[PDB]
Amino acid sequence: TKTSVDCTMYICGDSTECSNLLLQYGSFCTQLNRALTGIAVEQDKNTQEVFAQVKQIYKTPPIKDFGGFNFSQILPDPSKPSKRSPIEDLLFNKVTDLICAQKFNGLTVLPPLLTDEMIAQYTSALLAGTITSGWTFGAGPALQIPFPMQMAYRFNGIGVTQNVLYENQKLIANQFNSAIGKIQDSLSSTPSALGKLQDVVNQNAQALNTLVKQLSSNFGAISSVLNDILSRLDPPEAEVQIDRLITGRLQSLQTYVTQQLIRAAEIRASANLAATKMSECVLGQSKRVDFCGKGYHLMSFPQSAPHGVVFLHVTYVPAQ
Amino acid sequence: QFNSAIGKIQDSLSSTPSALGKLQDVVNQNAQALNTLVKQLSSNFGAISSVLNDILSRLDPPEAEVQIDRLITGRLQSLQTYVTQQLIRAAEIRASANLAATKMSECVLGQSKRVDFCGKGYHLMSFPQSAPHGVVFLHVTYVPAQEKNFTTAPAICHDGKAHFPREGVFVSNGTHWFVTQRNFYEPQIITTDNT
Amino acid sequence: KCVNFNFNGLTGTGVLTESNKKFLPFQQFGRDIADTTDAVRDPQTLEILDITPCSFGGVSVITPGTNTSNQVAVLYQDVNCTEVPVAIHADQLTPTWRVYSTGSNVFQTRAGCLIGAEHVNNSYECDIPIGAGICASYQTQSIIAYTMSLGAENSVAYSNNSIAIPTNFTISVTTEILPVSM
Amino acid sequence: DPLSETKCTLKSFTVEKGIYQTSNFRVQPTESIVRFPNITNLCPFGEV
Ligand SMILES: *[C@@H]1O[C@H](CO)[C@@H](O[C@@H]2O[C@H](CO)[C@@H](O)[C@H](O)[C@H]2NC(C)=O)[C@H](O)[C@H]1NC(C)=O
Ligand SMILES: *[C@@H]1O[C@H](CO)[C@@H](O[C@@H]2O[C@H](CO)[C@@H](O)[C@H](O)[C@H]2NC(C)=O)[C@H](O)[C@H]1NC(C)=O
Numbered sequence: 001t002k003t004s005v006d007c008t009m010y011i012c013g014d015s016t017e018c019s020n021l022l023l024q025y026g027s028f029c030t031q032l033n034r035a036l037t038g039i040a041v042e043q044d045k046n047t048q049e050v051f052a053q054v055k056q057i058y059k060t061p062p063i064k065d066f067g068g069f070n071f072s073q074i075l076p077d078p079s080k081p082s083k084r085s086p087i088e089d090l091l092f093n094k095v096t097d098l099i100c101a102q103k104f105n106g107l108t109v110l111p112p113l114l115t116d117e118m119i120a121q122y123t124s125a126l127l128a129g130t131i132t133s134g135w136t137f138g139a140g141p142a143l144q145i146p147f148p149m150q151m152a153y154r155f156n157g158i159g160v161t162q163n164v165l166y167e168n169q170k171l172i173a174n175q176f177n178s179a180i181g182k183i184q185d186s187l188s189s190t191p192s193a194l195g196k197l198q199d200v201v202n203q204n205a206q207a208l209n210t211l212v213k214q215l216s217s218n219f220g221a222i223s224s225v226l227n228d229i230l231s232r233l234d235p236p237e238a239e240v241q242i243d244r245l246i247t248g249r250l251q252s253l254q255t256y257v258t259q260q261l262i263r264a265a266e267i268r269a270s271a272n273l274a275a276t277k278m279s280e281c282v283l284g285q286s287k288r289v290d291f292c293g294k295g296y297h298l299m300s301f302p303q304s305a306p307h308g309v310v311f312l313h314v315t316y317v318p319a320q
Numbered sequence: 321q322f323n324s325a326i327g328k329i330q331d332s333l334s335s336t337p338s339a340l341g342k343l344q345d346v347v348n349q350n351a352q353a354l355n356t357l358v359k360q361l362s363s364n365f366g367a368i369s370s371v372l373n374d375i376l377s378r379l380d381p382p383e384a385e386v387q388i389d390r391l392i393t394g395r396l397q398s399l400q401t402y403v404t405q406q407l408i409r410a411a412e413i414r415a416s417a418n419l420a421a422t423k424m425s426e427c428v429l430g431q432s433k434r435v436d437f438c439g440k441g442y443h444l445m446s447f448p449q450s451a452p453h454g455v456v457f458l459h460v461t462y463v464p465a466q467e468k469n470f471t472t473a474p475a476i477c478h479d480g481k482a483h484f485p486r487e488g489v490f491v492s493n494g495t496h497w498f499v500t501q502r503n504f505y506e507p508q509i510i511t512t513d514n515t
Numbered sequence: 516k517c518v519n520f521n522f523n524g525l526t527g528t529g530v531l532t533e534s535n536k537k538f539l540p541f542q543q544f545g546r547d548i549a550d551t552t553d554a555v556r557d558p559q560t561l562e563i564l565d566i567t568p569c570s571f572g573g574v575s576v577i578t579p580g581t582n583t584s585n586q587v588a589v590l591y592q593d594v595n596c597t598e599v600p601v602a603i604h605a606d607q608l609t610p611t612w613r614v615y616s617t618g619s620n621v622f623q624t625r626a627g628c629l630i631g632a633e634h635v636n637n638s639y640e641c642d643i644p645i646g647a648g649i650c651a652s653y654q655t656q657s658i659i660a661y662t663m664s665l666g667a668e669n670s671v672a673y674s675n676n677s678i679a680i681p682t683n684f685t686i687s688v689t690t691e692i693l694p695v696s697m
Numbered sequence: 698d699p700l701s702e703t704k705c706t707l708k709s710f711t712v713e714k715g716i717y718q719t720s721n722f723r724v725q726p727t728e729s730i731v732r733f734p735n736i737t738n739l740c741p742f743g744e745v
């Protein structure tokens with residue numbers, strides 16, 4: 001989440017006298033604005049790098065016959081108004097007056113540049129490209145190739161001859177269809193799958209709530225209400241009392257920003273890794289061990305998630 | 321083709337001014353941070369004035385000490401704040417440096433098969449160039465062009481035995497069938513040596 | 516009405532309205548999650564009143580380069596197209612009051628209310644991001660707002676037994692810039 | 698005007714193309730009210 005903080009309102013509020021004293025407390029408010037703005041801008045860059053890997057918007061031809069491979073669970077659904085795949089909209093439900101109270105203290109949340117539909121529209125392009133053109137569309141013009149012939153190409157990458165696929169085309173298609181169906185039940189049955197995406201939401205909200213509770217701290221002063229202090233002490237007395245409150249509250253804001261800068265850097269590391277996975281595991285075939293799934297990598301399909309991305313790795317596993 | 325591509329590189333950097341924004345941002349942020357630290361010496365922080373000389377020369381030591389404690393603590397906060405951002409920024413610089421070291425090993429000292437790691441397309445070679453506070457790579461990539469249209473089959477049946485390509489793909493213009501490499505159109509007759 | 520108030524020394528500022536709170540007879544004033552005075556009881560008429568701060572929000576300015584033009588566009592964040600200022604008679608602290616602030620080109624988006632830009636039904640590349648899929652740009656001698664375009668439309672001619680094969684190639688050179696030290 | 702407020706924030710006479718956060722608006726109060734209890738008898742401070 002991208003956050004915007006009103007420096008004056010959080011510290012002072014409706015106290016006009018506090019606003020004047022804050023002027024001589026240096027340029028701390030400006031520094032806080034710049035630091036939080038850099039984090040908010042960075043968030044739009046992270047989404048752009050992962051998803052906008054293609055310049056064109058491909059579409060899947062109406063006749064959905066691909067030599068036995070369904071792709072129904074991962075392709076977009078016209079019936080849904082959001083136009084999301086049956087797996088994608090299952091993810092949007094697993095991941096989820098309090099907002100009003102935080103707003104009145106000067107804490108606001110800014111909306112992302114890319115809407116959910118726009119992001120889901122990008123993943124649909126990568127699905128149509130990866131099916132109708134294999135890996136060619138990631139390095140120039142997109143060239144069509146039959147999907148069963150494309151699988152035979154990927155079998156040669158892992159060291160298995162072409163004739164193995166062609167003699168087992170029916171069986172391999174059945175195995176892929178069965179594996180896909182079990183994916184939806186695994187997520188739908190087990191609500192703990194999206195633990196990583198939830199922690200990002202939880203830690204942001206919980207860190208913000210800590211900031212609000214800090215507004216009820218005396219910090220050694222007689223009271224934690226600015227109006228009472230001004231309306232109970234003479235001017236040269238109140239100064240030694242407001243200063244403790246202002247510095248106590250300035251420390252809280254500085255602490256919050258420092259934790260956010262640290263967390264943003266960790267997120268960017270995770271965002272950079274996901275962009276690498278999409279270029280190597282989705283736009284091509286990877287020989288790196290365990291990078292894209294466990295086994296011998298065949299292909300991958302991406303799915304958009306709230307504040308994240310989900311990769312479905314298709315792999316070859318020996319047996320018997 | 322190579323000489324023309326290398327020729328247009330100089331104009332692309334010269335003409336577009338925002339080409340080196342990544343290196344420029346490093347210099348500006350470091351300069352910006354130092355300007356803030358200097359400008360923060362002008363803040364009273366609730367004291368009578370920002371000048372240390374006049375405070376000691378206008379009030380007795382017993383009461384002047386509490387005046388300068390405001391200035392000392394506020395200024396120590398500026399230094400502590402300035403150091404904390406430097407540690408964070410240097411951590412993201414080291415991450416960029418690690419990526420640059422990895423790229424030189426993999427894209428310059430050899431040919432890389434990782435998609436989009438060294439340029440867009442099929443990687444051929446890279447060349448490094450030195451820049452202030454950074455490095456610049458020149459990725460050379462092979463890009464196909466001018467595709468055509470063909471009819472294909474998975475296998476060719478002859479004498480009751482199925483034949484598969486050894487390292488190519490079967491194509492035909494409509495009457496005669498050939499075998500060609502996948503990345504370039506060079507048809508050939510179908511024999512028992514390529515199948 | 517946005518007025519000051521004083522309830523037995525409880526000085527403050529805000530808007531007093533009716534409250535549906537099920538106040539108990541021994542209860543004096545309510546509070547919210549943030550541990551702040553949310554509702555109060557009048558000392559005289561013993562009426563429970565809500566307290567809500569007067570409207571506020573951030574303001575952002577959209578402009579091209581001053582080397583190009585001088586016109587600007589103003590975006591009021593989270594303000595819902597109606598509580599934007601209408602009077603300048605010493606009741607707002609922003610004298611940069613828009614020359615109309617109403618009637619003129621006013622657009623309401625999920626990122627706030629945008630005044631001074633014209634919405635269009637076209638779609639171009641994003642120039643200045645506003646939010647929620649809306650971008651702005653200076654086009655023609657004026658500032659306009661549009662919805663960003665993801666890219667050009669395409670449709671691969673997938674067929675049942677058809678392949679495409681290149682007949683030439685291009686040798687391309689591109690640059691990459693990375694900081695190494697500070 | 699809004700353009701000049703940007704110049705003040707950036708501390709520059711020339712502004713590059715983009716969107717900037719300048720300040721916050723709020724509705725100023727018009728009048729003030731006071732509500733106090735209804736009692737009038739003076740506290741017996743003469744006695745003590
Ligand atoms: C594989 O494709 C078939 C249709 O091509 C799907 O069949 C229907 O799928 C819907 C759910 O999308 C079910 O409600 C219907 O009962 C299915 N009909 C039949 C006759 O089975 C099938 O669901 C697809 N497989 C998967 C795993 O989604
Ligand atoms: C398809 O490819 C075949 C390859 O043999 C072409 O056939 C040759 O055509 C040229 C001129 O048209 C003749 O001089 C050769 O003798 C032909 N070769 C053979 C083996 O017959 C054919 O022209 C191509 N185009 C089509 C069939 O439309």
Ligand SMILES: *[C@@H]1O[C@H](CO)[C@@H](O[C@@H]2O[C@H](CO)[C@@H](O)[C@H](O)[C@H]2NC(C)=O)[C@H](O)[C@H]1NC(C)=O
Pocket residue numbers: 467468469670671672673674677
């Ligand atoms: C290869 O053939 C296919 C058809 O089998 C072409 O696809 C369509 O071709 C028609 C005209 O033949 C065009 O009007 C359509 O725009 C094409 N696309 C679709 C999705 O129908 C395809 O264009 C041919 N490829 C080349 C390079 O000519």
Ligand SMILES: *[C@@H]1O[C@H](CO)[C@@H](O[C@@H]2O[C@H](CO)[C@@H](O)[C@H](O)[C@H]2NC(C)=O)[C@H](O)[C@H]1NC(C)=O
Pocket residue numbers: 063065674675
């Ligand atoms: C590719 O060829 C196959 C035949 O091997 C086609 O499969 C049948 O196509 C007909 C025509 O639409 C359908 O009525 C049948 O239901 C299909 N059979 C199966 C098992 O799906 C396939 O349609 C062809 N593809 C295209 C695009 O023409």
Ligand SMILES: *[C@@H]1O[C@H](CO)[C@@H](O[C@@H]2O[C@H](CO)[C@@H](O)[C@H](O)[C@H]2NC(C)=O)[C@H](O)[C@H]1NC(C)=O
Pocket residue numbers: 466682683684
């Ligand atoms: C591959 O591309 C090259 C250049 O893009 C083509 O060569 C051009 O040929 C025309 C006429 O034959 C000349 O007028 C141009 O000057 C050539 N280009 C250059 C850069 O010298 C070549 O014909 C293409 N090959 C195929 C098979 O299409």
Ligand SMILES: *[C@@H]1O[C@H](CO)[C@@H](O)[C@H](O)[C@H]1NC(C)=O
Pocket residue numbers: 593594595
């Ligand atoms: C105007 O906009 C908000 C957006 O948060 C919307 O929920 C509602 O329609 C309006 N807000 C209020 C507080 O009435």
